[PDB]
Coordinates of C-alpha atoms in Angstrom, one line a residue:
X1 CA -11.8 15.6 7.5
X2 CA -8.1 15.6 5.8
X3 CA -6.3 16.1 8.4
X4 CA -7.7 13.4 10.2
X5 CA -8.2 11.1 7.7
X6 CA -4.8 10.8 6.5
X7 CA -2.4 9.5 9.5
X8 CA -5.1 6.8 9.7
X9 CA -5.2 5.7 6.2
X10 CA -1.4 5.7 6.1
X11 CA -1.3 3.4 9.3
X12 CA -4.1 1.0 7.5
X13 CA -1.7 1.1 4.7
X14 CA 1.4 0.0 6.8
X15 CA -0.6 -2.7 8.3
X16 CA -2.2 -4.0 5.1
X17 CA 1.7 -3.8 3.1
X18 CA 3.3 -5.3 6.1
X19 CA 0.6 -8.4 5.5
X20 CA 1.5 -8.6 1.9
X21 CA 5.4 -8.1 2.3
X22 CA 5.1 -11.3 4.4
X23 CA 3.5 -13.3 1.8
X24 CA 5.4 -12.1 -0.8
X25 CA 8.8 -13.4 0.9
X26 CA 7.2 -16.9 2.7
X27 CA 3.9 -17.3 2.0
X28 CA 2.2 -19.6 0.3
X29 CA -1.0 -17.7 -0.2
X30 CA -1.5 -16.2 -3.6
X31 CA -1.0 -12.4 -3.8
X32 CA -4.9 -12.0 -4.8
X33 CA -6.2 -14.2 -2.1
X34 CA -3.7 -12.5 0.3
X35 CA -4.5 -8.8 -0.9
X36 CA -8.4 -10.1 -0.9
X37 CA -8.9 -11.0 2.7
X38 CA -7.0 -7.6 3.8
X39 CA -9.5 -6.0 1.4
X40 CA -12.1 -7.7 3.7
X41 CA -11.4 -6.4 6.6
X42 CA -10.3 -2.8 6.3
X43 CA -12.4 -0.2 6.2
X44 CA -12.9 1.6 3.0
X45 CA -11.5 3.5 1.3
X46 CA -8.4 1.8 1.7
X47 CA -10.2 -1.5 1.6
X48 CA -11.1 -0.9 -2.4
X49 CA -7.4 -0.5 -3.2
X50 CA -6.7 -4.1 -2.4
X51 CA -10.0 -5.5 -3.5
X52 CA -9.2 -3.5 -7.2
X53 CA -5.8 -5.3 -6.3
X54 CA -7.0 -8.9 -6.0
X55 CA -9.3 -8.6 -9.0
X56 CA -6.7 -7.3 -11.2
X57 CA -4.1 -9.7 -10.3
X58 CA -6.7 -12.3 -10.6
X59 CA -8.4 -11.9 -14.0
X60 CA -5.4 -10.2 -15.9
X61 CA -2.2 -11.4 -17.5
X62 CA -0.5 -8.4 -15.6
X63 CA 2.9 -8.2 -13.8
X64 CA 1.8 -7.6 -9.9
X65 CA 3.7 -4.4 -10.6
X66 CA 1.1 -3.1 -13.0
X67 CA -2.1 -4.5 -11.5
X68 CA -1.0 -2.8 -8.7
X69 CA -0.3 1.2 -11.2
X70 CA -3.8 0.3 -12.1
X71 CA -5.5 -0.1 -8.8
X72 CA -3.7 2.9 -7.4
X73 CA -4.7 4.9 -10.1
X74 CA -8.1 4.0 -9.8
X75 CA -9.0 4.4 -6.1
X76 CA -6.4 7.2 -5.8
X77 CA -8.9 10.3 -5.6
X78 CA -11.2 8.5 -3.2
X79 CA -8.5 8.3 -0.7
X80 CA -7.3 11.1 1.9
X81 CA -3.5 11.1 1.1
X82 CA -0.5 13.5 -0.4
X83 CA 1.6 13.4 -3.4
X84 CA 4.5 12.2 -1.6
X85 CA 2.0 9.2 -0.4
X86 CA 1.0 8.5 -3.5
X87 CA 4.6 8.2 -4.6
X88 CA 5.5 6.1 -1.8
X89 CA 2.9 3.8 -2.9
X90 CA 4.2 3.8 -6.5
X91 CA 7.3 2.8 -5.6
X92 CA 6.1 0.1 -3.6
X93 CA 4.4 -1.0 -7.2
X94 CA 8.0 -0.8 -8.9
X95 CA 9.5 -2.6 -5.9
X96 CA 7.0 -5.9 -6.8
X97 CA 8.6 -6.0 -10.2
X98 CA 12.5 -6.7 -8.3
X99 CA 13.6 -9.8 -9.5
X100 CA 16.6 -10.0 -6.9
X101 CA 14.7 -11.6 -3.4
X102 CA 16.9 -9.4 -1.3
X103 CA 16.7 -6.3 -2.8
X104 CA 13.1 -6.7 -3.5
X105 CA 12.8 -7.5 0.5
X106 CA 14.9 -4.4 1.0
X107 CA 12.4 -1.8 -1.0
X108 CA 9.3 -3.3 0.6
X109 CA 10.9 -2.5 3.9
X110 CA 11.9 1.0 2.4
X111 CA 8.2 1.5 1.7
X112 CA 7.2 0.6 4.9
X113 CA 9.7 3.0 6.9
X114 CA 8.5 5.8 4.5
X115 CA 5.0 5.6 5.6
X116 CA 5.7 5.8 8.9
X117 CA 7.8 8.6 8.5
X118 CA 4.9 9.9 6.7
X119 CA 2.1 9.0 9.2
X120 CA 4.2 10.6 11.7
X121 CA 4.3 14.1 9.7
X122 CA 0.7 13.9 9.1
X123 CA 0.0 13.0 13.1
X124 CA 2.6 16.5 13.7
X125 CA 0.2 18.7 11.1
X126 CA -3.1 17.5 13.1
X127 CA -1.7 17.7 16.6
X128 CA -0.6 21.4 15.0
X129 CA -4.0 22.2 14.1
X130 CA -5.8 21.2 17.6

């Protein structure tokens, strides 16, 4: 059910891109392994976005900024989100294409807040509607 579904596949989402933020800025995991063993342990759907992540990243001589367009676009309809989540989420793809650390660091954090901010509006609809 929507409005159920959503607040918890935004706070899967947080968790998951708080994971990869950190091994983007000081890890010393690849992004596909890292985005591989969070695709192993959420639940789907969520989980296929950053198992269609790793592969692409993988097998591809794509930017991380396009493998991740292309995995967003693919799973997008099997997920339980809004516009303005899926936007979110494209700007987090733009933001892995920052060439600046700092800044880069800055936007991931900006994409962070924004779900949350989200995932609260989405827990305010639901609580609304019971």
């Amino acid at each position: 059910g929507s409005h159920m579904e959503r607040p918890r596949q935004i706070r899967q989402l947080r968790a998951a891109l708080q994971s990869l933020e950190a091994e983007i800025m000081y890890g010393h995991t690849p992004l596909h392994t890292a985005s591989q063993q969070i695709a192993k342990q959420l639940a789907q759907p969520v989980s296929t976005l950053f198992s269609a992540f790793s592969d692409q990243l993988d097998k591809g001589s794509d930017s991380a900024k396009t493998a991740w367009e292309q995995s967003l676009k693919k799973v997008w309809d099997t997920l339980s989100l809004k516009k303005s989540e899926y936007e979110v989420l494209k700007q987090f793809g733009e933001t892995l294409g920052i060439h600046d650390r700092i800044s880069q660091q800055k936007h991931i954090k900006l994409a962070l807040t924004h779900l949350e901010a989200s995932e609260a509006d989405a827990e305010q609809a639901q609580a609304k509607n019971e």
